[PDB]
Amino acid sequence: SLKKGPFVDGHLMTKIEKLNETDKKQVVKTWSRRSTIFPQFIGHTIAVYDGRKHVPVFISEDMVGHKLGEFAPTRTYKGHASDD
Amino acid sequence: NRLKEKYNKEIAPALMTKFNYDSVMQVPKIEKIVINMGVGDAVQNAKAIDSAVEELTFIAGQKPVVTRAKKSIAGFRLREGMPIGAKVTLRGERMYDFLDKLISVSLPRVRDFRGVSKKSFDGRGNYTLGIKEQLIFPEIDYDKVTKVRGMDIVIVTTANTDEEARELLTQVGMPFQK
Amino acid sequence: ARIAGVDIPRDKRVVISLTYIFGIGRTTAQQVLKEAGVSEDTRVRDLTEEELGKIRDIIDKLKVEGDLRREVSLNIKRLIEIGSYRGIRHRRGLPVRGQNSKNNARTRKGPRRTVANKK
RNA sequence: GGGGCGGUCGCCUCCUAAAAGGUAACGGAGGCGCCCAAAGGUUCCCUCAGAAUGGUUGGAAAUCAUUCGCAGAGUGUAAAG
RNA sequence: GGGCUACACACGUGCUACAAUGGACAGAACAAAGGGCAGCGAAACCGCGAGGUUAAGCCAAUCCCACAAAUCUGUUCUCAGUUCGGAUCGCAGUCUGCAACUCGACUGCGUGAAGCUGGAAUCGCUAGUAAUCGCGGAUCAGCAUGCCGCGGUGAAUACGUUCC
Q: Are B3 and B96 in contact (CB under 8 A)?
């Protein structure tokens, strides 16, 4: 990125804000993987829309600046014939 | 000898108050350090295993002795004869002159190292440690040795239990990962 | 051996001689020597008995060989336990920065060999 | 346990041999026409195999520290003693 | 939102090198052509750099993109996986864009693969051609080792139709 600053679409902002202030709801899908993780966002688990299937993702304290959608690879491995 | 005087005045009296002792006089004592070489030959034809033996004279002044194998191995050389590695058993005033170099100089020199030895205790007494660089010992020159050879240290405690053996080491100033 | 960065060589001028240090590069050497005022000096290794020490201190401020290796190691270990995707590229043999795979990129893949035919 | 064919012919260990010894069968299991100037002699010392625990390159094992180990070892080569 | 960028591998086609006719540093010097108003953006200033702040001029033989590079002149390294080469990756920044994870470019710092001229085989070119050095444009928000052009430096050989 650059400066001022990391950019969530902003709906995730109010969502995680309301989820932080109250309710403590867990597991929620999102199509907007472009959004970066935030300190207020910590500890939540989001189903990430790779396209084929949502992949749930827990948020450790260590991850912030990495993109939220980065953790789930759309790519399928490998695929190769004769292993070993 | 400064380390030797140190437990005669500082460590012991503090160690005495930490818990009770039968017959007052009893106190755990360091016995012997055993430094291993191993070398690994790779394979048998070093060709000079003795050149590694000369290197250990720098780490400690006691003369190293090659450890001849007492058993053959199918996976690696060799049947009895043609010794693998070397061993040293420094004692007396040499013991604390060497340990003083270990805490003050050797261990901090290592790159990634910050602290080790947690599960390392036998539950009986003896401490163990691994050493992977000659850079760790100041007396060795960088120009010598070139290729790295491995090293070991095994401090011995008189104490019958690891809980006493550990507490003795902490007052010596021995590092722990915690 | 040696006084600053461990195992600096011999019979070479001081700047390239401490570029070999796992930490300082070329321009950083230009900076530490700019602080030094040595002027190069010395082609071999003969600096000065105390100036070698004051340079040893400035180099000591910079950090640090195998611990710097521990920096990159702890960093990539941070990059694998985090999930992940970047360390995933670090251990697939996949290039990490993002530059295909359909051709070349053998820096991690290695040379040999081949296991396919048609028809 | 007809001959021929096959196998065997000597020495050494155990069992069959039945609590002295001996003791048969083309009975049951194995070895040997050596090897070593040292693995001999003498003197002075030492105690194994395997297990658990801790450990750098050491992985199920090369190396080392420790409790356990009346011998689960070794005794040139094969068995009994 | 992905994918068109897959990844054990094969092939085609380019780029960069494997170095002392060289590398690195300093100084000095010679171009052409093309583009520019939803643009080019000088100069001044800030940042090591990339760029930013601010803003003159230019609808352009006026001004801007813009500095030509090889080269020459000296200093330095003295034949090695190297002060050779830059890969790969880490960290920290930056331009464009609602937005740079997949899957952008650039910079600073750090890391310093392979490669010391390449088997069988194969390609181009008869002179300003081959050899090589830089520049611009179409493309285009951003992204040009590709393509299309511009100029600098600038050869060797051609006996001949036996053979392909």
A: yes
The CA-atom distances, in angstroms, between B16 and each of B20, B112, B118, C60 are 7, 35, 24, 41
- Count of CB atoms situated within 10 Å of the CB of B84: 20
Residue C52 C-beta-side C-alpha neighbours within 13 Å: 12
> Distance (Å) from CA A3 to C1' E92?
14
**Residues in chain A within 8 Å Cβ distance of C84:** 66, 70-71
Q: What is the resolution of this structure in A?
A: 5.4
Residues 6+ apart with CB under 8 A from B58: B137, B139, B140, B144
Question: Is strand E within 7 Å of residue C114 (CB)?
Answer: yes
Give the determination technique.
Answer: cryo-EM
Cβ C73–B112 below 8 Å, yes or no? yes
Whether residue B143 and residue C70 make contact (CB cut-off 8 A), yes or no, is no
Q: In terms of DSSP bridges, do strands A28-30 and A54-58 run parallel, antiparallel, or are they unpaired?
A: unpaired
Q: Distance between CA C12 and CA C16 in Å, rounded?
A: 7
Do B and C touch (≥3 CB pairs < 8 Å)?
yes
List the end-to-end C-alpha distance of chain C, in Å, as a whole number. 61
What's the distance, Cα to Cα, between the start and end of chain B in Å? 29
Strand order in the sheet with B35-36: B35-36, B86-88, B65-66
Sign of the dihedral defined by the CA atoms of residues B151, B157, B160, B165, in that order: negative
What are the backbone angles phi and psi of residue A54, rounded to the nearest 5°?
A: -70, 135
The Cα A2–Cα B3 span in angstroms is 56
Residue B166 near residue B136, CB atoms below 8 Å? no
In this complex, the answer to whether residue C76 has its CB under 7 A from any atom of chain E, a nucleic strand, is yes
